[PDB]
Design a protein around this ligand. Sequence first.
Ligand code: K
Ligand code: K
Ligand code: K
Ligand code: MG
Ligand code: MG
Ligand code: MG
Ligand code: MG
Ligand code: MG
Ligand code: MG
Ligand code: MG
Ligand code: MG
Ligand code: MG
Ligand code: MG
Ligand code: MG
Ligand code: MG
Ligand code: MG
Ligand code: MG
Ligand code: MG
Ligand code: MG
Ligand code: MG
Ligand code: MG
Ligand code: MG
Ligand code: MG
Ligand code: MG
Ligand code: MG
Ligand code: MG
Ligand code: MG
Ligand code: MG
Ligand code: MG
Ligand code: MG
Ligand code: MG
Ligand code: MG
Ligand code: MG
Ligand code: MG
Ligand code: MG
Ligand code: MG
Ligand code: MG
Ligand code: MG
Ligand code: MG
Ligand code: MG
Ligand code: MG
Ligand code: MG
Ligand code: MG
Ligand code: MG
Ligand code: MG
Ligand code: MG
Ligand code: MG
Ligand code: MG
Ligand code: MG
Ligand code: MG
Ligand code: MG
Ligand code: MG
Ligand code: MG
Ligand code: MG
Ligand code: MG
Ligand code: MG
Ligand code: MG
Ligand code: MG
Ligand code: MG
Ligand code: MG
Length: 88
Amino acid sequence: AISQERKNEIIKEYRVHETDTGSPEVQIAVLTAEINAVNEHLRTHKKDHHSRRGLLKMVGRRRHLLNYLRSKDIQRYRELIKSLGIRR
RNA sequence: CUACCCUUGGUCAGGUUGAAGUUCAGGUAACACUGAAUGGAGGACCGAACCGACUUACGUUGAAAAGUGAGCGGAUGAACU
RNA sequence: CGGGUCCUAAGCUGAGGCCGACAGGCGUAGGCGAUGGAUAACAGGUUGAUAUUCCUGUACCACCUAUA
RNA sequence: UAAGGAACUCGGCAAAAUGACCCCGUAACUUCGGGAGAAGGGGUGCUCUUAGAGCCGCAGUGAAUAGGCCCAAGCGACUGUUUAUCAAAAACACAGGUCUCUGCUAAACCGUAAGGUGAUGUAUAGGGGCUGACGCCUGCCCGGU
RNA sequence: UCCUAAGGUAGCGAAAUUCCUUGUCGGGUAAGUUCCGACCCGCACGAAAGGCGUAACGAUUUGGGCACUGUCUCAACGAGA
RNA sequence: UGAUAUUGAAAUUUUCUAACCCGCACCACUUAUCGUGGUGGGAGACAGUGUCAGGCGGGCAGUUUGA
RNA sequence: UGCAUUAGCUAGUUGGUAAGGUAACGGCUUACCAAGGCAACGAUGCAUAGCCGACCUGAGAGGGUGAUCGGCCACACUGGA
RNA sequence: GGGCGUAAAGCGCGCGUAGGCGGUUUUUUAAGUCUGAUGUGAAAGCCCACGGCUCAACCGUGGAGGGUCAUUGGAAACUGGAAAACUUGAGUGCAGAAGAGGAAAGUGGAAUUCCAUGUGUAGCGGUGAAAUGCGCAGAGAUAUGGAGGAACACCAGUGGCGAAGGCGACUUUCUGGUCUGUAACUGACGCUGAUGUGCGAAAGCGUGGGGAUCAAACAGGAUUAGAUACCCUGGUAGUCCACGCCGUAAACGAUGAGUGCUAAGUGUUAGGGGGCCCCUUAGUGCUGCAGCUAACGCAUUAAGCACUCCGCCUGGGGAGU
RNA sequence: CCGUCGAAGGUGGGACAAAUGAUUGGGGUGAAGUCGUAACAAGGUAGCCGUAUCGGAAGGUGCGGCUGGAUCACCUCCU
RNA sequence: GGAGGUGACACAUGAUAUA
RNA sequence: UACAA
Ligand SMILES: [K+]
Ligand SMILES: [K+]
Ligand SMILES: [K+]
Ligand SMILES: [Mg+2]
Ligand SMILES: [Mg+2]
Ligand SMILES: [Mg+2]
Ligand SMILES: [Mg+2]
Ligand SMILES: [Mg+2]
Ligand SMILES: [Mg+2]
Ligand SMILES: [Mg+2]
Ligand SMILES: [Mg+2]
Ligand SMILES: [Mg+2]
Ligand SMILES: [Mg+2]
Ligand SMILES: [Mg+2]
Ligand SMILES: [Mg+2]
Ligand SMILES: [Mg+2]
Ligand SMILES: [Mg+2]
Ligand SMILES: [Mg+2]
Ligand SMILES: [Mg+2]
Ligand SMILES: [Mg+2]
Ligand SMILES: [Mg+2]
Ligand SMILES: [Mg+2]
Ligand SMILES: [Mg+2]
Ligand SMILES: [Mg+2]
Ligand SMILES: [Mg+2]
Ligand SMILES: [Mg+2]
Ligand SMILES: [Mg+2]
Ligand SMILES: [Mg+2]
Ligand SMILES: [Mg+2]
Ligand SMILES: [Mg+2]
Ligand SMILES: [Mg+2]
Ligand SMILES: [Mg+2]
Ligand SMILES: [Mg+2]
Ligand SMILES: [Mg+2]
Ligand SMILES: [Mg+2]
Ligand SMILES: [Mg+2]
Ligand SMILES: [Mg+2]
Ligand SMILES: [Mg+2]
Ligand SMILES: [Mg+2]
Ligand SMILES: [Mg+2]
Ligand SMILES: [Mg+2]
Ligand SMILES: [Mg+2]
Ligand SMILES: [Mg+2]
Ligand SMILES: [Mg+2]
Ligand SMILES: [Mg+2]
Ligand SMILES: [Mg+2]
Ligand SMILES: [Mg+2]
Ligand SMILES: [Mg+2]
Ligand SMILES: [Mg+2]
Ligand SMILES: [Mg+2]
Ligand SMILES: [Mg+2]
Ligand SMILES: [Mg+2]
Ligand SMILES: [Mg+2]
Ligand SMILES: [Mg+2]
Ligand SMILES: [Mg+2]
Ligand SMILES: [Mg+2]
Ligand SMILES: [Mg+2]
Ligand SMILES: [Mg+2]
Ligand SMILES: [Mg+2]
Ligand SMILES: [Mg+2]
């Protein structure tokens, strides 16, 4: 869905420190771009159920990371919520 | 006159109902979906004008060679003129 | 003022033209044809009988002639 | 108009009853729109205070005008149309269905023809036959015509 | 068994079709040749001269009930032409 | 539907063009979706039309359908 | 205690203020204000049932019963004071 | 104090909410847990002891028992609450690799059917045997060309991919997942999953296209005592496409998911490390111990040994009514 | 004496529940009367599952699936 | 040798218990 | 064998 160049752009922007690729903020931001791209694919490929199943897993993984971030530090969580186009 | 049509005009008191859309709100990953408001559709509803003629009474050397009285059907439409 | 001296609709008619025993039928250009388009005046007074028409006051339109 | 209340009659024909506005409340069935004004019930006068307190009559939309309602069955889906002048209907039409003809100077129709309609349209179009919303469906026979 | 091209599927049925006939049974009535629901013995239903149903609609046809009444028992009085 | 006339030219049904036809395009008459001519294109001795013939023909007509 | 083949219930309802009322607190009652309160941890509705010490059974864990004796409640032909 | 491969019993399969459950360590707390104190758990009853009834029933007296009870003082291992660390679980990054995973649009070869043309003549077709059927108006056969729909030989393999249903010509575009290595990173972020929400062979349904082959129904021909069949000749829906619906199958491994542990041998698929072999991951098969099983059998892909969560069963018929 | 609240009663339309109703549907049991012979063997067309359709009936046929299918082949695997 | 994949005319019927 | 037909 997204290139390694676009992924590295997102990692650079949302990392909480240098050499960070595994924080919730980095993962949620990358998952958000991937979810948006597959939604773009599914708008002209409505019958692609198999791809849509993979999108549903990304949405579930993002929601779990968001729940963990919210319960650990709500300040980091609410700043990430506005940065992306995410409600809750 | 009447039937149908052509061209060009005109007319339809007031009430009632509340379609599609839209917006806001919930809701979603994105749609579906839902409520409120808005909106004003319909050979839609009730009912004058108007157009009819279902029932009944009267009239039947008529007021009238087809009518009158009382109700009755349609009444933004395939309307009436 | 309404109509004509303006415009076209349906329709009618139709120089030439096409068709048809005859008589005639159709039709092109064009023409006629309002129920539509265009278009300059109002208020008051007056008679037995007319009135945006007569009369009074105040206008507007088209055309003509002269100064411009 | 006593008492009765459809016993009248082919048939409740005619008449009586209902009726306005405001507020409650409303069934089977349903194509989810409806059915529905379903049904069934409450309130209306006048005066005073700012919803209460009073006043009067037999009666308060005090006159006139203003849906009767319910249950079930046949037919037709529906609005519409018809025998001017004894029939308005279950008849006609209808949206929908199907069959069939028609390649365009189309087929079909009027006309002797010319000229036209079809159509200033072109098979998602035009003419003709039958059926008649919608739902579920539409079996057998091609010997004869 | 005979014959045919083939001998009526689903659904419906005393029906706007049933002659016998007021068929028979049930419901409704005190009493119902009409009505409703069933049966099938369909004189002589039957699938686009469509079959079976169907919410909504009807001055349609048919049966029942409430309200209501001079329709009636059974007529009487009054107003006017 | 056939013959024949309009109706010709070559092969063996095919070909051709020149009669006939075009509710085919452009041009002129001409401010004209008529018409008439001109040029292209299509079609073509077919079609259309005349005469003759056979067939179908309640679409329409005249009649009959006894005592 | 059953039943989800019972999922929505409530509008004095839930809270507040004031007054009234009671032996007493209290929506207990009324007036005004606000829109709360309950529920899948089963609200609500329907059905069933007086509850307990005890009693019967069982190795026990459990299952079954509430006559007699004792505690508590409710009722006194039905309903309202 | 039971089960769910074949006896009744694993939802067809995902995603996921509530809930249940949850890796290592330190500090802290004290709800659960443990341990005393106090109060209370009436009397009668039951049980033990003793006394009175001639005995016994029975009666009486003294004890014991019965709470998930409350209040209060201690303990701190485990469960829970708070705080702080951790990297093994789970994710991310980086480096490789394989794949009929999915959606869309294009290109191609064989064959079937139909159509035309040329040659060419008497049958072709079909069965157990036949007949229906097609054919002298030229079939069938043969050669060439065209139209059209459908499906993709060989490759092809207890091979591969996918949650399952499923996925097989080739090309491009869009896109999902998995595996191996590394140890940058985050630091338990996990597992399961009622309700829910989605996907789901074939048949079937709606609208509209398409229509080669095959083929319910149906017709004819056979067979047969009959033949509403099996066989033959045809043939409609359907089979194909798009968009909706339906939500079911012996949807099967008749075996729910997760995690760990427990002999070996031997094929195969995709990788990695080291010297064709040895080691090692992850799949996919066969054989086979321990163990399990009623037996059959299963056996590191468990039906073994364990913990967590879900679904389901409780004799047969009636009745999945 | 007047008004608000007030049981019972009456009026109305619905909700629910139990009884019964011409006729009607399927089931169980009893007996084997009748018609066939569908399954069990390759049960004489392998059977079963879903679905569709047809038929006196068991059942047939189509499409997909399963082996919980007999007999004989050609291959992978194991011993 | 044993498995797993692959492929490959007609024949109706026979009551109840007790066996 | 006792039955059934
Ligand atoms: K007019
Ligand atoms: K037509
Ligand atoms: K014929
Ligand atoms: Mg007027
Ligand atoms: Mg109307
Ligand atoms: Mg009206
Ligand atoms: Mg009229
Ligand atoms: Mg009148
Ligand atoms: Mg009306
Ligand atoms: Mg003329
Ligand atoms: Mg005058
Ligand atoms: Mg009277
Ligand atoms: Mg009276
Ligand atoms: Mg009365
Ligand atoms: Mg009478
Ligand atoms: Mg009488
Ligand atoms: Mg009347
Ligand atoms: Mg009124
Ligand atoms: Mg009608
Ligand atoms: Mg009408
Ligand atoms: Mg008349
Ligand atoms: Mg009349
Ligand atoms: Mg008709
Ligand atoms: Mg014939
Ligand atoms: Mg008769
Ligand atoms: Mg008929
Ligand atoms: Mg027919
Ligand atoms: Mg017919
Ligand atoms: Mg009809
Ligand atoms: Mg009346
Ligand atoms: Mg008089
Ligand atoms: Mg005649
Ligand atoms: Mg004559
Ligand atoms: Mg005579
Ligand atoms: Mg009781
Ligand atoms: Mg026991
Ligand atoms: Mg057991
Ligand atoms: Mg299990
Ligand atoms: Mg079994
Ligand atoms: Mg089983
Ligand atoms: Mg399973
Ligand atoms: Mg299943
Ligand atoms: Mg004693
Ligand atoms: Mg990579
Ligand atoms: Mg991979
Ligand atoms: Mg899970
Ligand atoms: Mg579930
Ligand atoms: Mg299908
Ligand atoms: Mg066949
Ligand atoms: Mg289809
Ligand atoms: Mg589809
Ligand atoms: Mg199962
Ligand atoms: Mg397991
Ligand atoms: Mg395990
Ligand atoms: Mg083994
Ligand atoms: Mg292995
Ligand atoms: Mg058999
Ligand atoms: Mg068999
Ligand atoms: Mg069959
Ligand atoms: Mg399968």
